[PDB]
Design brief:
This protein is an all-alpha fold. The chain contains two helices and no strands. Helix content is 77%, strand content 0%. Sequence repeats lie at residues 1-39.
């Protein structure tokens, strides 16, 4: 295929902010296990 080098870099920025925001607005087990474990 062609014209992928562009669409690629465009995806990177996505996953980058995704795993950054998601892990900063989700914490499904983070604040669930740390709140019980961490004393």
């Amino acid at each position: 295929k062609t014209k992928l080098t562009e669409e690629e870099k465009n995806r990177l920025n996505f996953l980058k902010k995704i795993s950054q925001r998601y892990q900063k607005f989700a914490l499904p087990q983070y604040l669930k296990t740390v709140y019980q474990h961490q004393k």
